[PDB]
């Protein structure tokens, strides 16, 4: 929601290679930046299932 | 943040009164909006301490009178704490020297109290 | 060393970081001290 | 008084950077700029006018130091 | 030796203070160092370093030596710092073998380190003045007799005295006096014809100068070892054998040193002659006792000769090894049970043994004996030889046999005892400091009574002391007191095990 | 990130750092390789020399000597990995003067 | 790609671009052309002072759509960020206090870096004056092709924008194009006339 | 009331460079140590004077002017025997809540040392009769932050007679 | 295969064996008495050097009445090196 006015009309819009949450009324952002995994590390990491991570 | 000496030099209430008056006049001559809004506790503590000192008999004092009182009391072998308390309290009565003053035993001698009164009244 | 300056994220000693700058502020070193009355 | 009386390029760069950072923080202008909105241009004008209130504190490697004013140093 | 350093730090903080315990810990950790680097590393004032060094060298805790360029190096003795915990036992044994006069003598010698005979007899008289009453007074004759009796029995020894500087290179004096020691006057007492009477502390020129004495901890250690082996042989065979071995040890005290594999040859005739007359035992019964002690599977004594009738010798190292074995098996039994103690004694008797052989000889079912073996191996009480079939040392193709190393076991047990005493001291100090408010409250409400005890003693100040809020808290005070008492008793009890382990460790050291 | 399709930025390789060192641009290099790439704020305790969080040292169980400090995130990751290897880098802080 | 070489000695940064280059003789040797598309993305944080107040007001009034403008506004008291794409931009423009951080678009006069991926000597990366053009390529004077060792045959070129006044000043002074006309190897000038200029 | 030597690092922003440094330093020091208590020192009141003021550095970071200033400031710390004059700003059954005049409400004298005629029955009764004097006994300090006050002290009330007020 | 435990072991695991009760008698009582007496009497001795109190507030008339006066032992400088004279 909006920290100042309290408007809950926050919309996700794709910026110039940037993801953020912004309200359409006052144009104020509440959360900017997103952390995503890299394919360089994705091929290195091994997947674990709950059928094996529980015994 | 470090402290060098917590008891470097003891001072009476007259120096504190003078410092409070100087800070008050400096603030009223150089008043700032944002500087005040940053910490309003400064004006509060200064005004309240100044009012507390004004309620005391600390008025009508000067550094020359304080120096004369110190030189007069230095001849009665009294310690710094007792003369400091006498200057801060300014006892116009003998009972405050005979009873309220600590370590009255062997120090009254029934004759120096009159001299102490004559010095504190001046 | 410059390597650890780059790693630790501090300005390196070489280059512009060798010397230091001082602001020419209007002041008075060792200002007059308020005299002590009781002491 | 033993170092070079001229003002090097690294000292110029650092002084201009510090002055631009200060002016960007609402510092008082000493050259009375005429329509210069770029703080680096204001720093260049102040360096040309030789009125930068910054004193270079050169440090010798042994520990000794020396102070040099902008007007005292020779610019290029 | 982290546990040793911690115990020494706690003991120094409890006995001498804070500014000196830091210097002591620094000396113990960094070894011998000059005063300058000590003051530099500690980061305190020079005068405090000097005071700490002097108060440490007063109690003979540290020493100083000379080296190249005439520099003085101060080295601390961690063993000497550890031995001062055994002071109550020293006072008890000197009060048991002697009167209370020797008790006070040894107490003053331990609390002061170095003193003269006149000083110690004066202090003993002054302390005993308040003990007795009825207006009579004591002299210095009996105190001097007790002192010389302690001296000839080697309980007290003269401190190393600086030689005559006038005869030894009269001129520029070295930075250190280079204190030396002579075995001639080690137990000799110069004549002090002066006498006097102690004052009752009413509070209303040195003939023995340069001669300082101190309690000989070696004699106390030897006496405690003798008492331990006497108690052991008493619990083994009988009290008569204990008396026989006590007499033979009393005879061997003088003719033997503190470190020797065996004692001097003693014949049965002189032992019988020196035996107390309180026992109606004949020579044949004594010979039977000696020949049955020689056949003991413990090998405490040995024949080692046939001349002079019945010639016999005692085994100090073997007796200490047996005592260490008994202590180790006892602690194993108390920590893991009787079955694990049986397994431990089995694996100790046999030099090497296998798991199946352990189960066969100990008669313990599976899944439990191996568990006890693993629990005992995880505590560094046993070791695996691991004889390999191949230099690869693969576990699948090698044997494993359990073996008890008594030396490493005794060392780790001594370390555990040190850390245990350190933890007990820490708990005592914690309980003391957590209740310091109630302690000060009790002190003030009892000093209201301590004041005006006789002069100006009105009865109106007796019904208001218990009226304070400390009355419901007296149970907490009693619990604190009993806890401190139990902790001190436990520390003193562990001190005997520490002494036994240290004696067993030191006896096998050759210092070569 | 690395790839262009992954919205990745340019990489200041070793040779670019070498050129920036040769130019002597200390502040430019500091802004590029620290401020604009992996800038982060950590908490260090001046007593034990370890890393804290939210102005609190879990090791000493106190917060008097804890102070904030700017650092590249890669350096903090390196310190954490070294601490995992039982190799503890004890950071002894000091005043900027 | 470890921590030392891939994450400490050299690491990736933001506020950078990579584009194809093309010759342009109509620009000074210390100037470089920047496309409008990249200029609308790369932003510089300027602090509001008593001098550039009206310029920043006009930039905010223009918005993130017109080229001269900004994208985000950061207040002084609170650390909140306001996107200029939504809301009445005139209100935020009229409520611009001193010390606010405004992320303005890349405009003319800004000192910007210019670097090629293979860096042999220090002249491979140099600071120039940024200029905007409606085209989509990095254009600069060909006299600087000799230090960059470029040939305009499809080679990509990097461009880094500092986010600090100190870094910008250091780039303009030390890495200035007019101040690095000669190589430190032997003092021979590198930025000089080239083909189609000598003939 | 006693002077304390304090050495502090003061950061003055560049937009205050037009002001005199010896005044901005004092203003910032007064704003930083107003109505605060220094640990094991006492409640500081205000800056008394400035003894030493060395060069004003400028760091490559924020860019503001950093100065290491040596000064003397007044603090309130009795000597365990000083006599003070406080006013009764409340009272509890376990102890009277007397506050120094407009200075600080930190003095809580325990009602367990005067003659046995002390009882507070929650009706604002100071002391059962047979501008109040106060004798400090011991200081005490503590911390505040313990997760991601500090000066009260005890008071002595001996048999001072109190001819003016019971 | 060992099962999974959902709770870590307690900080103080219980053991079926307990410490042997302490030895009693006049010996241990005298041990306690003597140890307490030594702990008490050793603190007031001049060898126990307390930390020098600092930041003295003021000097008062009753200082000489409350001045901590204790006899100071003089170490034998003949046995002590010269580097420890104050
Ligand atoms: Mg090409
Ligand atoms: Zn809003
Ligand atoms: Zn810590």
From Swiss-Prot, chain B:
GO terms for molecular function: calcitonin gene-related peptide receptor activity; DNA-directed RNA polymerase activity; nucleotide binding. The keyword Nucleotide-binding does not apply. It is found in: Nucleus; Cell membrane. Its main location: nucleus. It comes from the Eukaryota. GO terms for cellular component: acrosomal vesicle; cytosol; DNA polymerase III complex; nucleoplasm; plasma membrane; RNA polymerase III complex. It is a peripheral membrane protein. Keywords: Antiviral defense, Cell membrane, DNA-directed RNA polymerase, Immunity, Innate immunity, Membrane, Nucleus, Transcription. The keyword Secreted does not apply. One of its GO terms (biological process) is neuropeptide signaling pathway. Ubiquitous. Most prevalent in testis. Component of the RNA polymerase III complex consisting of 17 subunits: a ten-subunit horseshoe-shaped catalytic core composed of POLR3A/RPC1, POLR3B/RPC2, POLR1C/RPAC1, POLR1D/RPAC2, POLR3K/RPC10, POLR2E/RPABC1, POLR2F/RPABC2, POLR2H/RPABC3, POLR2K/RPABC4 and POLR2L/RPABC5; a mobile stalk composed of two subunits POLR3H/RPC8 and CRCP/RPC9, protruding from the core and functioning primarily in transcription initiation; and additional subunits homologous to general transcription factors of the RNA polymerase II machinery, POLR3C/RPC3-POLR3F/RPC6-POLR3G/RPC7 heterotrimer required for transcription initiation and POLR3D/RPC4-POLR3E/RPC5 heterodimer involved in both transcription initiation and termination. Belongs to the eukaryotic RPC9 RNA polymerase subunit family.
Curated annotation (Swiss-Prot), chain D:
GO terms for biological process: transcription by RNA polymerase I; transcription by RNA polymerase II; tRNA transcription by RNA polymerase III. Keywords: Acetylation, DNA-directed RNA polymerase, Nucleus, Phosphoprotein, Transcription. One of its GO terms (molecular function) is DNA-directed RNA polymerase activity. It is found in: Nucleus; Nucleus, Nucleolus. Changing residue 10 to N: In a breast cancer sample; somatic mutation. It comes from the Eukaryota. GO terms for cellular component: cytosol; fibrillar center; nucleoplasm; nucleus; RNA polymerase I complex; RNA polymerase II, core complex; RNA polymerase III complex. DNA-dependent RNA polymerase catalyzes the transcription of DNA into RNA using the four ribonucleoside triphosphates as substrates. Common component of RNA polymerases I, II, and III which synthesize ribosomal RNA precursors, mRNA precursors and many functional non-coding RNAs, and small RNAs, such as 5S rRNA and tRNAs, respectively. Pol II is the central component of the basal RNA polymerase II transcription machinery. Pols are composed of mobile elements that move relative to each other. Belongs to the archaeal Rpo6/eukaryotic RPB6 RNA polymerase subunit family. This is DNA-directed RNA polymerases I, II, and III subunit RPABC2. The chain holds residues 51 to 126 of 127 of the full protein.
UniProtKB/Swiss-Prot annotation, chain F:
A zinc finger (C4-type) spans 45-60. It is found in: Nucleus; Cytoplasm, Cytosol. It comes from the Eukaryota. Zn(2+) binds at residues 45, 48, 57, 60. DNA template strand binds at residues 4-5, 11. Catalytic core component of RNA polymerase III (Pol III), a DNA-dependent RNA polymerase which synthesizes small non-coding RNAs using the four ribonucleoside triphosphates as substrates. Synthesizes 5S rRNA, snRNAs, tRNAs and miRNAs from at least 500 distinct genomic loci. Pol III-mediated transcription cycle proceeds through transcription initiation, transcription elongation and transcription termination stages. During transcription initiation, Pol III is recruited to DNA promoters type I, II or III with the help of general transcription factors and other specific initiation factors. Belongs to the RNA polymerase beta chain family. This is DNA-directed RNA polymerase III subunit RPC2. It comes from Homo sapiens (Human).
UniProtKB/Swiss-Prot annotation, chain G:
Belongs to the RNA polymerase beta' chain family. Mg(2+) 1 binds at residues 151, 153, 155. Mg(2+) 2 binds at residues 151, 153. It is linked to Leukodystrophy, hypomyelinating, 7, with or without oligodontia and/or hypogonadotropic hypogonadism: An autosomal recessive neurodegenerative disorder characterized by childhood onset of progressive motor decline manifest as spasticity, ataxia, tremor, and cerebellar signs, as well as mild cognitive regression. Other features may include hypodontia or oligodontia and hypogonadotropic hypogonadism. There is considerable inter- and intrafamilial variability. Wiedemann-Rautenstrauch syndrome: An autosomal recessive, neonatal progeroid disorder characterized by intrauterine growth retardation, failure to thrive, short stature, hypotonia, variable mental impairment, and a progeroid appearance. Clinical features include apparent macrocephaly, sparse hair, prominent scalp veins, entropion, greatly widened anterior fontanelles, malar hypoplasia, and generalized lipoatrophy. Death usually occurs in early childhood but survival to third decade has been reported. RNA binds at residues 116, 155. This is DNA-directed RNA polymerase III subunit RPC1. Expressed in the brain, in the cortex and the white matter (at protein level). The gene is POLR3A. DNA template strand binds at residues 5, 12, 18. It comes from the Eukaryota. It comes from Homo sapiens. It is found in: Nucleus; Cytoplasm, Cytosol. The modification N6-acetyllysine is found at residue 97. The chain holds residues 349 to 547 of 1390 of the full protein.
């Amino acid at each position: 929601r909006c920290p100042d006015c309290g408007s809950t009309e926050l919309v996700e819009d794709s910026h110039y290679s940037q993801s953020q949450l912004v309200c359409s009324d006052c144009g104020c952002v509440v959360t900017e930046g997103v952390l995503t995994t890299t394919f360089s590390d994705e091929g290195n990491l091994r997947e674990v299932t709950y059928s094996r991570s529980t015994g | 943040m470090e402290v060098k000496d917590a008891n470097s030099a003891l001072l009476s209430n007259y120096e504190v009164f003078q410092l409070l008056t100087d800070l008050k006049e400096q603030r009223k001559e150089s008043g700032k909006n944002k500087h005040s809004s940053g910490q309003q506790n400064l004006n509060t503590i200064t005004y309240e301490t100044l009012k507390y000192i004004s309620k005391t008999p600390c008025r009508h004092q000067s550094p020359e009178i304080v120096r004369e009182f110190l030189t007069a009391l230095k001849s009665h072998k009294l310690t710094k704490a007792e003369k400091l308390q006498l200057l801060n309290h300014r006892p116009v009565t003998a009972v405050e020297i005979q009873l309220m003053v600590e370590e009255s035993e062997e120090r009254l001698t029934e004759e120096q109290i009159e001299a102490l009164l004559h010095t504190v009244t001046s | 060393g410059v390597s650890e300056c780059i790693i630790m994220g501090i300005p390196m000693n070489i280059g512009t970081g060798l010397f230091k700058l001082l602001h020419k502020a209007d002041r008075d070193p060792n200002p007059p001290k308020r005299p002590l009355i009781f002491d | 008084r033993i170092t070079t009386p001229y003002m090097t390029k690294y000292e110029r760069a650092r002084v201009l950077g510090t002055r631009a950072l200060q002016i960007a923080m609402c510092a008082p202008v000493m050259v009375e700029l005429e329509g210069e909105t770029d703080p680096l241009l204001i720093a260049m004008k102040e360096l040309k006018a030789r009125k930068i209130p910054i004193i270079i504190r050169r440090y010798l490697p042994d520990g000794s130091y020396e102070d040099w004013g902008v007007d005292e140093l020779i610019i290029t | 030796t982290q546990a040793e350093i911690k115990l020494c730090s706690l003991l120094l903080q409890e006995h001498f203070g804070e500014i000196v315990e830091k210097i002591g810990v620094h000396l113990i950790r960094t070894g011998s160092q000059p005063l300058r680097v000590i003051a530099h590393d500690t980061g305190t004032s020079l005068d405090q370093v000097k005071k700490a060094l002097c108060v440490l060298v007063q109690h003979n805790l540290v020493s100083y030596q000379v080296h190249k360029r005439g520099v003085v190096e101060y080295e601390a003795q961690c063993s000497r710092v550890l031995r001062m915990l055994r002071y109550p036992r020293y006072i008890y044994t000197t009060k048991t073998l002697y009167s209370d006069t020797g008790e006070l003598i040894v107490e003053e010698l331990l609390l002061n380190g170095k003193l003269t005979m006149s000083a110690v007899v004066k202090k003993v008289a002054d302390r005993l003045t308040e003990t007795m009453e009825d207006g009579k007074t004591m002299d210095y004759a009996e105190v001097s007799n007790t002192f010389v009796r302690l001296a000839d029995t080697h309980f007290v020894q003269r401190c190393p005295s600086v030689p005559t500087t006038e005869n030894s290179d009269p001129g520029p004096p070295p930075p250190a006096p280079t204190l030396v020691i002579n075995e001639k006057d080690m137990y000799l007492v110069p004549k002090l014809s002066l006498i006097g009477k102690g004052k009752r502390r009413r509070s209303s020129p040195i003939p023995d100068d340069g001669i300082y004495w101190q309690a000989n901890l070696d004699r106390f250690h030897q006496h405690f070892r003798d008492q331990a082996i006497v108690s052991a042989v008493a619990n083994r065979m009988d009290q008569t054998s204990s008396e026989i071995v006590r007499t033979m040890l009393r005879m061997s005290e003088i003719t033997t040193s503190s470190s020797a594999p065996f004692t001097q040859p003693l014949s049965s005739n002189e032992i019988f002659r020196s035996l107390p007359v309180g026992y109606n035992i004949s020579k044949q019964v004594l010979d039977q006792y000696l020949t049955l002690l020689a056949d003991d599977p413990l090998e405490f004594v040995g024949k080692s000769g046939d001349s002079g009738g019945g010639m016999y010798v005692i085994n100090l190292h073997k007796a200490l090894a047996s005592l260490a074995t008994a202590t180790l098996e006892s602690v194993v039994q108390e920590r893991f049970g009787s079955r694990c103690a049986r397994i431990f004694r089995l694996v100790l008797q046999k030099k090497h043994i296998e798991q199946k052989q352990v189960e066969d000889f100990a008669m313990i079912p599976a899944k439990e004996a191996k568990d006890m073996l693993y629990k005992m191996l995880s505590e560094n009480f046993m070791s695996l030889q691991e004889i390999p079939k191949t230099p690869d040392h693969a576990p699948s193709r090698t044997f494993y046999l359990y073996t008890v190393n008594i030396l490493s076991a005794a060392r780790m047990l001594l370390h555990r005892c040190y850390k245990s005493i350190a933890n007990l001291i820490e708990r005592r100090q914690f309980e003391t400091k957590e209740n310091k408010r109630l302690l000060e409250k009790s002190q003030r409400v009892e000093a209201i009574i301590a004041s005006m005890q006789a002069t100006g003693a009105e009865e109106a100040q007796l019904q208001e002391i218990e009226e304070m809020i400390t009355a419901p808290e007296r149970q907490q005070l009693e619990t604190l007191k009993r806890n401190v008492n139990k902790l001190d008793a436990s520390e003193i009890q562990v001190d005997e095990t520490i002494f036994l382990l240290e004696s067993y460790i030191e006896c096998t050291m050759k210092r070569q | 990130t690395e790839g262009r399709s992954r919205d990745g930025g340019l990489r200041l390789g070793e040779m670019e750092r070498d050129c920036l060192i040769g130019y002597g641009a200390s502040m430019l290099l500091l802004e590029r390789l620290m401020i604009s790439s992996d800038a982060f704020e950590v908490d260090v305790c001046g007593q034990c020399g370890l890393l804290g969080y939210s102005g609190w040292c879990h090791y000493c169980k106190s917060s008097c000597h804890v102070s904030s400090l700017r650092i590249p995130y890669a350096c903090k990751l390196l310190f954490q990995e070294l601490q995992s290897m039982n190799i503890i880098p004890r950071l002894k802080l000091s005043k900027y003067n | 790609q470890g921590r030392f070489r891939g994450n400490l000695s050299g690491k990736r940064v933001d506020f950078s671009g990579r584009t194809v280059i093309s010759p342009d003789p109509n620009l000074r040797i210390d100037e470089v052309a920047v496309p409008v598309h990249v200029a609308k993305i790369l932003t510089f944080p300027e602090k509001v002072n008593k001098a550039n107040i009206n310029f920043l007001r006009k930039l905010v009034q223009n918005g993130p759509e017109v080229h001269p403008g900004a994208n985000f506004i950061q207040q002084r008291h609170t650390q909140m960020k306001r996107f200029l794409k939504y809301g009445n931009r005139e209100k935020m423009a009229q409520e611009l206090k001193y010390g606010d951080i405004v992320e303005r678009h890349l405009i003319d006069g800004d000192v910007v870096l210019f670097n090629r991926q293979p860096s042999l000597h220090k002249l491979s990366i140099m600071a120039h004056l940024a200029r905007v053009k409606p085209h989509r390529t990095f254009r600069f004077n060909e006299c600087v092709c000799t230090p960059y060792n470029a040939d305009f045959d499809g080679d990509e070129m990097n461009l880094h924008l500092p986010q600090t006044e100190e870094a910008k000043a250091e780039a303009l002074v030390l890495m200035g194009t007019k101040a690095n006309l000669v190589t430190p190897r032997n003092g021979e000038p590198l930025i000089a006339a080239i083909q189609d200029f000598l003939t | 009331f006693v002077l304390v030597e304090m050495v502090d690092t003061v950061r003055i922003p560049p937009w205050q460079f037009e002001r005199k440094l010896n005044d901005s330093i004092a203003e910032e020091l007064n704003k930083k140590l107003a109505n605060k208590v220094v640990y094991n020192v006492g409640l500081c009141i205000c800056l008394f004077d400035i003894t030493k003021l060395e060069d004003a550095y400028v760091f490559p970071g924020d860019g503001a002017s950093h100065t290491k200033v040596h000064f003397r400031c007044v603090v309130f710390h009795p000597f365990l025997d000083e006599i003070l004059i406080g006013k009764i700003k409340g009272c509890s059954p376990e102890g009277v809540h007397v506050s120094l005049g407009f200075f600080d409400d930190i003095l809580i004298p325990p009602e367990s040392l005067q003659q046995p005629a002390k009882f507070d029955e929650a009706e604002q009764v100071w002391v059962w009769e047979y501008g109040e004097e106060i004798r400090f006994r011991v200081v005490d300090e503590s911390f505040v932050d313990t997760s991601p006050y500090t000066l009260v002290g005890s008071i002595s009330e001996p048999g001072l007679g109190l001819l003016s007020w019971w | 295969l060992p099962d999974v435990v959902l709770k870590p072991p307690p900080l103080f695991p219980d053991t079926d064996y307990k410490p042997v009760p302490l030895k009693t008698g006049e010996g241990e009582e005298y041990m306690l008495a003597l140890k307490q007496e030594l702990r008490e009497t050793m603190k007031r001795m001049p060898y126990f050097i307390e930390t020098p109190e600092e930041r003295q507030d003021i000097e008062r008339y009753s200082k000489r009445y409350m001045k901590v006066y204790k006899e100071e032992w003089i170490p034998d400088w003949r046995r002590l090196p010269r580097e420890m004279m104050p």
